[PDB]
Design a protein around this motif. Structure first.
Motif, PDB file in Angstrom:
ATOM      1  N   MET A  39       0.811  -1.206   0.000  1.00  0.00           N
ATOM      2  CA  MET A  39       0.000   0.000   0.000  1.00  0.00           C
ATOM      3  C   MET A  39       0.846   1.257   0.000  1.00  0.00           C
ATOM      4  O   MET A  39       1.356   1.674   1.030  1.00  0.00           O
ATOM      5  N   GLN A  98       0.779   5.317  -1.176  1.00  0.00           N
ATOM      6  CA  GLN A  98      -0.095   6.419  -1.535  1.00  0.00           C
ATOM      7  C   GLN A  98       0.728   7.691  -1.622  1.00  0.00           C
ATOM      8  O   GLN A  98       1.940   7.682  -1.413  1.00  0.00           O
ATOM      9  N   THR A 148       4.065   8.969   0.372  1.00  0.00           N
ATOM     10  CA  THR A 148       4.845   7.844   0.862  1.00  0.00           C
ATOM     11  C   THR A 148       6.273   7.953   0.356  1.00  0.00           C
ATOM     12  O   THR A 148       6.502   8.261  -0.813  1.00  0.00           O
ATOM     13  N   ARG A 184      -6.526   4.807  -4.713  1.00  0.00           N
ATOM     14  CA  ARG A 184      -5.878   5.129  -3.452  1.00  0.00           C
ATOM     15  C   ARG A 184      -4.476   4.559  -3.318  1.00  0.00           C
ATOM     16  O   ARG A 184      -3.534   5.308  -3.061  1.00  0.00           O
ATOM     17  N   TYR A 185      -4.307   3.257  -3.483  1.00  0.00           N
ATOM     18  CA  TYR A 185      -3.053   2.612  -3.148  1.00  0.00           C
ATOM     19  C   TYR A 185      -2.405   2.019  -4.383  1.00  0.00           C
ATOM     20  O   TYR A 185      -3.067   1.744  -5.384  1.00  0.00           O
ATOM     21  N   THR A 213       7.054  -3.996  -0.964  1.00  0.00           N
ATOM     22  CA  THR A 213       6.269  -3.291   0.033  1.00  0.00           C
ATOM     23  C   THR A 213       6.274  -4.091   1.317  1.00  0.00           C
ATOM     24  O   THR A 213       6.391  -5.316   1.300  1.00  0.00           O
TER      25      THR A 213
END
Lengths: 55, 209, 113, 122, 120
Positions: D1, D3, D6, D31-32, D65
């Motif tokens: 995730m 966004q 970040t 969003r992500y 991630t």
RNA sequence: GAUGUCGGCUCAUCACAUCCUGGGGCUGAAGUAGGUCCCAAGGGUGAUGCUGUUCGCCAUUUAAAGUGGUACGCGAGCUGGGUUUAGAACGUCGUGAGACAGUUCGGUCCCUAUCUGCCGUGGGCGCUGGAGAACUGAGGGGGGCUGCUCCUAGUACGAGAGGACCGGAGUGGACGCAUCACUGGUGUUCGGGUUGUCAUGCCAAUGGCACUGCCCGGUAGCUAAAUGCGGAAGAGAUAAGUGCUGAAAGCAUCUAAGCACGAAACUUGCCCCGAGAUGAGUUCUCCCUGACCCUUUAAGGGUCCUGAAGGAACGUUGAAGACGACGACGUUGAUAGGCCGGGUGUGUAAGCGCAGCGAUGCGUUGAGCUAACCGGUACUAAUGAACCGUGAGGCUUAAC
RNA sequence: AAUUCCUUGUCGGGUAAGUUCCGACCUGCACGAAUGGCGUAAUGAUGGCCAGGCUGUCUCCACCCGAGACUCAGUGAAAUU
RNA sequence: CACAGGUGGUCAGGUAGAGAAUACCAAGGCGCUUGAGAGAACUCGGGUGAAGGAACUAGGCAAAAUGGUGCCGUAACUUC
RNA sequence: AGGACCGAACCGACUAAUGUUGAAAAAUUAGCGGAUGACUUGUGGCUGGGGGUGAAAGGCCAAUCAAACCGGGAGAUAGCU
């Protein structure tokens, strides 16, 4: 937040149409002492379902 | 086509040999016993009324008992109706089992969702919460405005507000049939279905496909 | 829950070795890169075990090519081919989450004898 | 995730050290960005004599991630930090020539064959 | 929502519930019959009966556990010396709850809870 | 004898002069693209830097970032940055007090809802003898968006660059819905560590308090960030538009007769509620077929015997629930607690032994304990009563 | 500039994005030397800006724990009309 | 008002602690003149949170964060 | 040594929420400033209304201040409601 007109006595009794109490109408009798009591409750003399439980 | 009445047993996985996990819901479909057949001449439409499970003989009233006795079947825990298509016919007293779904591969599962009680607008309608800080006064989860002004002068019917949520009949469509197990009275469908464990489920072949 | 119990029982592996958090295990996983199906080894420290019947899982932490990576394996999955314990670790806890902040000499685990 | 805002580490030898996601692109209100997704970034830190400069705006692909990826098995692979690979803004091809740290299986898409070939692992 | 949760909180915080039930269990053990509100009974059982089960088997460790749950050596002594032996063959259910009306002060539903033996 | 101002926020609803997606005519329309006009509101239509700002300009998205109405929608929903009190200063003006839609700094936002309106949840009566279920569908609501890739197909086109119509297929984004297999969160209600202090006569071993003292983990439940599914295909009538035959008005002419088509609109189809649908419907089943008296006599009232189907009450309770309601259960019993066995979580309990000067280690021992989980088990609590509800159901015609 | 209306002047710096800030130019509507000018170490619950750390401020909320609200018994107001 | 507000002086025990700070206790003194249940929204005051990390807002308001002692070391500038 | 520094009492009062028919006609809670001084506190006294007193705010002067309160003139006056 507050009334604009005085509610009548009619609306008062119409709201209290639901405020009536209900009687128990269902007293049980102990098989030994013969006393009246609430169903599933100890009698005033301390019996329950025919047995002396408190004294 | 007709469907069958089962109960939600729980939820698990099936591992496939090629290393895929399939989340399945286990639905126990006992024999469904036809208690009444409704026809166009007498009832104005075509359908069958089925029963399943069992009920304690002390909990079945003589109206229900007499209705069951006319069909000559044992008492079940309830009665459900299924609308009949043009082709199929059934006879009162017949029992229908889970291999009805032997070659179906999509079902529609209907159940009563879990009851959430009196729910607020944030939970019920996905309303956005207001500021947690920056001066907000007693208004962190309240709905906000609900109407315009003098010109409407009222709140429009169907406005989204807090109230009862869940505990209502919900259908989930086009679920993969993963396994039919006749000897165990089991049906396994891919995914989640409405209702808590042990609740009644109505399974029908997919209407949209 | 008897019937779900039996459904899960049909699916369990019978050859899962016993291991504890802190052990160094090596896991063989099936890798498909087209028409070729391969075994890849993933070796590290067992930092957590979720033993929940068919749904059992365990987490393995490895320092690979400079940075840490940890994989949560689904025990009883056919993707997992074999599990073998390479070294027994002696730890007090059931979940070794504190190891994420510790490297090098600070991350050593004494061997269980 | 991943966004907007970040911060990311850089997984190639292009010269950047820290980049910040400017836009999760590929949809409205999206969003992500997970592993394998394309994002637009700005460079917050770079080595003195790299191929890119501080403040450059260009694209990147997310390769690691610490939320992780899930396999059809149900298993999950998490990393210790978030990493990306810089790509040319027009032709989405890597800027660097070395790839650092493991990558994951989801990049095999005929668009990231360079990353798969150059990577040390998986 | 309260799905499948157990344990009344009785308009009290955790430590106060724990202390109150410790005291009430001590009272029931020493007196063998006490009178409380119906909701406080039906919660006393979940406390007092496990102590009797613990007391069916006598050992130093079990006595220390009982003392930890009820910090009164008289209660531990009576438990392990009489109540364990008295209920040796009883498979749970060592208490009775008898509804006994309503309290004058606040109309709370009262009940009597007693050990099923009380030496009758 | 008071109708709070701007902006943001939360929440909106409607119009069409439609931004996107859909249909079509004209092109100075080869394709790719457009332009312009017509029809069409079903759904969708960015989050950020600066500024109090609407706006604007940026920097990147997107299918697109519509325009207006709604007291420039919305302060008994919220904020209060701005404007618009009382303090102070600056530039300017005035002899001055003071001024200034010039500037700057700081500057008390109350409202326990009667009625309508709305979201939920119940009673009372009616429904024409009562009852238990199961139904129907007359109406209401909801959903109703779109990208990218690939194939068709480098085919058509162009001259080359570039590159289709029409057909499909697969994966996304936003959005909704169910759920908790997994993966995570929370878990003061389960174990472990640890600090100060106070007690348990004392040592050990425990407890109390210091925010659950601080913490490390974690069962159920709930959750989302986890995962399943779904917004239709198809019809019918159409809009713009296009036609066929065809006169008036030998020709012609989509229109006048007549016959066809045609869109995310419409009506259905997908989902939900629903006979107070007073227009109160339907099918199956259960139960009651005793007298007597008095009169205004009328669809009359009592009396005695009788009380049925069923329902309620009370109690054990619930992945039901503010409260009602709803669901299971009452001994013909697993409805709750406890209990037994397991599971699970924590991680090798106490006691004792051994080693070491000791702290400590070690073993017995993965030992001890374990909320709500699973599978059982009548050990405790679900007591006979009683209560309510009746004694064959109006009239008129028509059939049989 | 606590002053420059115009004006968000212009240029440079800082961000991907800068009517704020900081440094310039003078183009001072309408600074100016004890109704003091210009600097200045330190200091201020002073005013404007940029970093790091840090986080539920937010993306976007989710659970747990109390006190109310809900219900029951006792008591029992107000504004307003 | 038997009102969570104010009101001069004197005394000052133990264990930790620099301390009359603070934690727990001693002597003593109290549990706050309505209680009992259920365990809804929403409110209040707290605890904890995945990936992120000021993107929020008029504005980091609020929250979170730092903290103690010994010791090493410390920048421009300066009115030293 | 110090109108030094940190920090209890003590004296104040920057911010946030809450409370707004409040527990209170300005508090509570969490932080905050000072804390050997231009410090604070006790008990007496002294200055009076166009007056006092003021490290300045048209502040304060018995929950009252561009002129305190009490009583008189006085049934001031009011082309106004």
């Amino acid at each position: 937040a507050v009334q604009q007109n005085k509610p009548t006595r009619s609306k008062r009794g119409m709201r209290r149409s639901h405020d009536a109490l209900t009687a128990v109408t269902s007293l049980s009798v102990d098989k030994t002492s013969g006393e009246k009591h609430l169903r599933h409750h100890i009698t005033a003399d301390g019996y329950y379902r025919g047995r002396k439980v408190i004294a | 086509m007709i469907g069958l009445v089962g109960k939600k047993v729980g939820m698990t996985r099936i591992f496939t040999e090629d290393g895929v996990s399939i989340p399945v819901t286990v639905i126990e479909v006992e024999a469904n016993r036809v208690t009444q057949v409704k026809d166009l001449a007498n009832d104005g439409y075509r359908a069958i009324q089925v029963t399943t499970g069992a009920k304690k003989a002390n909990r079945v009233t003589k109206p229900e008992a007499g209705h069951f006795a006319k069909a000559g079947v044992e008492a079940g825990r309830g009665l459900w109706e299924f609308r009949l298509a043009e082709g199929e016919e059934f006879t009162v007293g017949q029992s229908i089992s889970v291999e009805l779904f032997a070659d179906v591969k999509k079902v529609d599962v209907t159940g009563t969702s879990k009851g959430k009680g009196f729910a607020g607008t944030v939970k019920r309608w996905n309303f956005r919460t207001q500021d947690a800080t920056h001066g907000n006064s007693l208004s962190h989860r309240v709905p906000g405005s609900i109407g315009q002004n003098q010109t409407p002068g009222k709140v429009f019917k169907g406005k989204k507000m807090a109230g009862q949520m869940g505990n209502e009949r919900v259908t989930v469509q086009s679920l993969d049939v993963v396994r039919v197990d006749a000897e165990r009275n089991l049906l396994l469908v891919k995914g989640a279905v409405p209702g808590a464990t042990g609740s009644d489920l109505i399974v029908k072949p997919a209407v949209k496909a | 829950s008897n019937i779900i119990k039996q459904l899960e029982q049909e699916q369990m592996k019978q050859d899962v070795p016993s291991f504890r958090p802190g052990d160094t295990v090596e896991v063989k996983v099936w890798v498909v890169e087209g028409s070729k199906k391969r075994l890849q080894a993933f070796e590290g420290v067992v930092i957590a075990i979720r033993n929940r019947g068919l749904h059992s899982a365990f987490t393995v932490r490895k320092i690979s090519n400079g940075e840490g990576v940890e994989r949560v394996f689904q025990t009883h999955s056919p993707v997992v081919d074999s599990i073998s314990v390479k070294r027994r670790g002696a730890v007090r806890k059931a979940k070794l989450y504190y190891l994420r902040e510790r490297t090098g000499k600070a991350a050593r685990i004494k061997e269980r004898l | 995730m991943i966004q907007e805002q970040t911060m990311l580490n850089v997984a190639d030898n292009s010269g950047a050290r820290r980049v910040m996601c400017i836009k999760v692109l590929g949809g409205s209100h999206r969003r992500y960005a997970g592993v394998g997704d394309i994002i637009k970034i700005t460079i917050k830190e770079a080595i003195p004599r790299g191929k890119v400069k501080k403040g450059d705006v260009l694209k990147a692909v997310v390769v690691r991630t610490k939320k992780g990826v899930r396999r059809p098995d149900g298993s999950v692979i998490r990393f210790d930090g978030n990493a990306c690979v810089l790509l040319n803004n027009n032709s989405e091809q890597p800027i660097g020539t070395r790839i650092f740290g493991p990558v994951t299986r989801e990049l095999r898409s005929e668009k990231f064959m360079k990353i798969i070939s150059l990577a040390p692992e998986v | 929502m309260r799905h499948r949760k157990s344990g009344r909180q009785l308009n009290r915080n955790s430590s106060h519930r724990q202390a109150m039930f410790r005291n009430m269990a001590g009272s029931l053990v020493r007196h063998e019959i006490i009178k409380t509100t119906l909701p406080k009974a039906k919660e006393l059982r979940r406390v007092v009966e496990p102590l009797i089960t613990l007391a069916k088997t006598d050992s130093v460790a079990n006595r220390r556990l009982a003392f930890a749950r009820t910090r009164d050596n008289e209660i531990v002594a009576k438990l392990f010396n009489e109540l364990g032996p008295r209920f040796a063959s009883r498979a749970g259910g060592y208490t009775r709850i008898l509804k006994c009306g309503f309290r004058a002060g606040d109309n709370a539903p009262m009940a009597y809870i007693e050990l099923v033996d009380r030496s009758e």
